[PDB]
Subunit: 333 residues, 3 copies
């Protein structure tokens, strides 16, 4: 169980038994705080948080985890020039490494984070890159374990519905490759991940006791699901015209009550990394209902999001406990 | 009995509770001045939501937190305001799972009301369009310190300028709870909503006070123990809107002649800040050249710098009263 | 040492040589204490405001980490909206912050700003960089020079700054020689020399301490016998400054001309040495600056380069300033 002074760049750098140990430490740390017996292992330690792109949830998780454990943080938010434009990453890592005990990087390509790791001389943790999002996956795996206790991940069935090509989709293939989940990607074929990545993650997951299924057939795809998972269909970085065709393509794949009933599982739980477009009284939600008929929600309805099946807020809380585990395990012995 | 309650506006409390809160601010001010502050918020994490910037409010919350042993996460203005893309409810519930208390500053009172309904932890209004309670906490403690022998219902407070805003609304609230003799000295298009005026005037009268709205400066300021003002213009509004507000309000500039009109040599000057009193700042120079505003705008440099002016006691007191709010609501 | 309590740190010339030496010995103490896990926090209960009117990741991290190690808390007030003095007066800013904070760092625009904050704050104000002076960097550099050239007093050392010196870095070089007796050479084009009255003031003070200050376009004469070589980034308009300054690049040839194979290289950072960066590929492609700009990557990564010790020592010296001016 030695993560000490290791990096945390992507969940694939670890074995199933290590991810399990990291999750058990997070559950202990979580329980420790709930019971007011939290032992700080990071008193004296200073952490730098590089954010080349904004994410509040990920910042607050790193900040609160550090504070609970007694560390102090410097938040280095977006400043324009990405590292490697004007100044080499080599140079950034060696200056921060002299000064900080640990470095979170959230931003662009995995090549960036991997270079920062090689030169910092201190643990580097990936809060998100274009390619991998291991803190979010950790948090999802901990939530899944808490609500379906006593079952290995290869005793579980996960549905991810909607657009499986985006960065959260690839994380699902990563999750099943390492844990052996029974994974079902319920999406229109235009939004399927690259077939090569699919062939290769299925083999890894098959060898781990699970499978990966890609299908446009919702009623078949979701049978037996323990958890349904979705994310937003569109991006504020594209125009109105792009939204129209994404919504027409994907609206049939909305997680709604009828989808959940198609599972045949009365204890199915619902997951969403957030932010979620479920409330049609927001400014954007009122436009989407008026323009596209999306009353009651988009990728997930308000009824499901607010139902007892929804654990999205346990899931968000767990960002913090899992990130705390990463930092305690890589910075203290 | 502020434990786990919110701080959204002054009239969510009784006079005796506000009095209890002011005496706590005084104790925590004295404890820090004497070097014997007791950290009550150690282990607490606080989130500061700033949809609009205000360094005075940010620093007051940061230093009070830090003095009490807490840690803070400052969420500055960032893209789309809460409730545009993501539900207020969702922001509330995610923050509440991670933080022990939340400060909000930005837009409508309904935003901070929703945050408080769904966060599960105390939520403190650091300023909305409609109310600004922590500022008025500081002003009341400042007033008590500078007239320590008088009760609030023995004091006369003039607020001059434009009162159709969160400051005018909060003056009314404060008068309702303390019995102040409150004069809003302003043009008639600049008075707060009649309904709120009516409600607070009846309450002020029961606490031994009054609320008078008038365009008549000389009668308005007669007897003032304190004169209070704020800037006439918000940055980012059109040039025509600056020129119409200046034309309408410049007669209500707090200047030496207005202080003299009180007949009170002891009269003191308050201003929530920032203030436009210095015609040598870059903006001061543009307003002096364009509108003739030499000597300052809503208040003159002479008044601002004079012994009458207690604006920086008032700024410090932002921190101490905000500390009492957090201490009172986060610990028992 | 309590002679420092409640003082400002606006520029080196506000101090005596003995006082500068006191701040360095404290910096070395605090650095050795950290290395050994025996740092004693002097700043518990203290809150510090960092006014950054211009971005500087190195200066900010140094101040934050120094604060945190000593048990203080910080409020980073970075760039947002209008600068101090545009809408609100410097004085007003100083008097509000001074009521809530135990000290104020300022970084950004002119020296009159930091000086007005210090006049009115009522608490210690530290200059983290103005257009005219950059004293915390020079402290870090002085400590770095003493560490890598141990058995020598400052007035027995020869330091060269190469590049553009008509700015806060040349000005502060002048200050450091005036306070320590360095044998200081500024090796730069004639259009890149600092103001003459500062040169004159500092040249005498330096002579009273056993050193000299020399300004020359002549590189071989300028860098002869140097113990250290220092430079900084030179920067259309870009093109005016490159052609003017590229012959003053610090490369293997320039260090050879010192005749001192123990010469060390200093750079305040950030540095343009890597020609594989987005900017570095554009500068090689468009101006023929292969292998770097004001310092070649060969010098930058050589055993002669001590830039990352210099950078760490930003923190230790900023720590010493804040400990000496805040704790009685
Ligand atoms: Br902190």
């Amino acid at each position: 169980s030695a993560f000490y002074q290791k990096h945390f760049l992507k969940l694939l750098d670890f074995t199933p038994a290590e991810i399990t140990a990291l999750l058990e430490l997070a559950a202990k740390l979580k329980a420790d705080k709930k019971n007011g017996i939290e032992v700080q292992k990071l008193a004296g330690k200073n952490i730098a948080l590089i954010f080349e792109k904004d994410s509040t949830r990920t910042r607050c998780s790193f900040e609160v985890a550090a504070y609970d454990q007694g560390a102090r943080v410097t938040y280095l938010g977006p400043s324009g020039s990405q590292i490697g434009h004007k100044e080499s990453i080599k140079d950034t890592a060696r200056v921060l490494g002299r000064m900080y005990d640990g470095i979170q990087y959230r931003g662009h390509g995995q090549e960036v984070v991997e270079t920062l790791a090689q030169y910092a001389g201190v643990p580097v943790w990936n809060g998100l890159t274009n390619e991998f999002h291991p803190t979010q996956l950790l948090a999802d795996l901990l939530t899944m374990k808490e609500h379906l206790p006593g079952k290995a991940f290869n005793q579980m069935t996960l549905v991810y519905a909607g657009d499986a090509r985006n960065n959260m989709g690839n994380s699902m293939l990563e999750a099943a490759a390492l844990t052996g989940l029974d994974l079902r990607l319920v999406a229109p074929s235009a939004c399927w991940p690259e077939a090569a990545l699919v062939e290769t993650c299925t083999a890894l997951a098959k060898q781990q006791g699970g499978n990966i299924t890609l299908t446009e057939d919702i009623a078949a795809g979701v049978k037996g699901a323990d958890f349904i998972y979705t994310d937003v269909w569109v991006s504020m970085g594209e125009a109105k015209e792009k939204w129209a065709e994404r919504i027409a393509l994907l609206r049939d794949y909305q997680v709604n009550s009828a989808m959940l009933a198609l599972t045949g599982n009365p204890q199915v739980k619902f997951l969403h990394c957030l932010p979620a477009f479920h409330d049609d009284q927001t400014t954007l939600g009122k436009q989407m209902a008026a323009d596209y008929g999306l009353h009651g929600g988009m990728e997930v309805t308000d009824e499901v999001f607010e139902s007892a099946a929804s654990v999205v807020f346990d899931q968000a809380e767990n960002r913090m406990h899992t990130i705390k585990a990463v930092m305690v395990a890589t910075l203290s012995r």
